Amino acid sequence: WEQLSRHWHTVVLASSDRSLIEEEGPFRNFIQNITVESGNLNGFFLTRKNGQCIPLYLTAFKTEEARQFKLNYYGTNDVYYESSKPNEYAKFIFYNYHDGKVNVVANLFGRTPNLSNEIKKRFEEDFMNRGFRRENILDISEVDHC
Amino acid sequence: WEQLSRHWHTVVLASSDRSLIEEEGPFRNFIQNITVESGNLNGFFLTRKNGQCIPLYLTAFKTEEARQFKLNYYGTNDVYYESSKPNEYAKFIFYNYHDGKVNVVANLFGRTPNLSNEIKKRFEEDFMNRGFRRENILDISEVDHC
């Protein structure tokens, strides 16, 4: 898992709940880098709250299950890692349970600040195919993230 | 996946939406057996619809990600397999996308029509912890089914 131990860029964000990833949303976070320790993912993000960029430390604890991690943040998040190009991008999918509800927050991280269209298009399609609206898929490689 | 190709039993079912697994629900299915072919999971089930038991064939198609499959059934289902004792029980978590809503359907299968209390207990706890209530977790080893 030491491969994920690098600098990253939040390229695209999508969620079944628009508000989770819009300005001021708990998941509108910009990854800076990931440090792997004993299989655990220690991510350092920057999130913009009340107009300012503040540090955010999130730890995806490795579970006995493969590619799966556990993260406690605004509820319990079952986390899944996936990538067809491990050296170029990383997708992190969060299944969030909070206040008796289930949501999905999908993250498209890139080793570069932007990714190829083939990659982004696949991400967009995968989620549009799952009933999402286009307002639920944010391509932030365009916006002004922290 | 050779340990999955045998006869299975649906022991406990859990869902974020209780109706999906209650009587008449599209996901209240009683597994008969699973046959593996080319990496895909070909499960044969029995489901009581409109009064009686009828055959049900579902294929969990392999993906490029470890332990993850795909199933089109009452929406798109991203299926994950996990099990600490591969020869006693099998767990399949479905992340269902239908009508813009996201739901989770977890299945606890066993080589025998019932599982140890410890196994069932942990399954129940895991989802009790994710905000599910007692009525969302149905042990069916007890009730009579197809």
Structure description:
Chain A has 146 residues and is mainly beta. Chain A has a single domain (1-146), classed as Lipocalin (Beta Barrel), CATH 2.40.128. Chain A is 11% helix and 49% strand. Chain A has 2 helices and 9 strands. Chain A has helices at 18-21, 117-128; strands at residues 9-15, 29-37, 40-49, 52-62, 68-72, 76-82, 89-98, 101-110, 137-139. Chain A has a 9-stranded antiparallel β-sheet with strand order 2-3-4-5-6-7-8-1-9. In chain A, a hairpin with a 2-residue loop joins strand 2 (29-37) and strand 3. The longest helix of chain A is centred in the C-terminal third of the chain and has 12 residues, at 117-128. Chain A is globular and about 35 Å long. Chain A starts with 8 loop residues before the first strand and ends in a 7-residue tail after the last strand.
Essential attributes:
homodimer, 146 residues, mainly beta, Lipocalin, 9-stranded antiparallel β-sheet, 2 helices, transport protein
What strand line-up does the widest sheet of chain A have? Answer: 2-3-4-5-6-7-8-1-9
| Portion in strands of chain A | over 45%
Major beta-sheet overview of chain A: 9 strands, antiparallel
Determine and state the CATH class of chain A: Mainly Beta
Helical/strand content category of chain A: mainly beta
Oligomer: homodimer
N-to-C order of helices and strands of chain A? EHEEEEEEEHE
Looking at the structure, what is the overall shape of chain A?
globular
PDB class: transport protein
Keywords: lipocalin, beta barrel, milk whey lipocalin, Glycoprotein, Milk protein, Transport, transport protein
Assembly: dimeric
Entry title: Crystal Structure of the Possum Milk Whey Lipocalin Trichosurin at pH 8.2
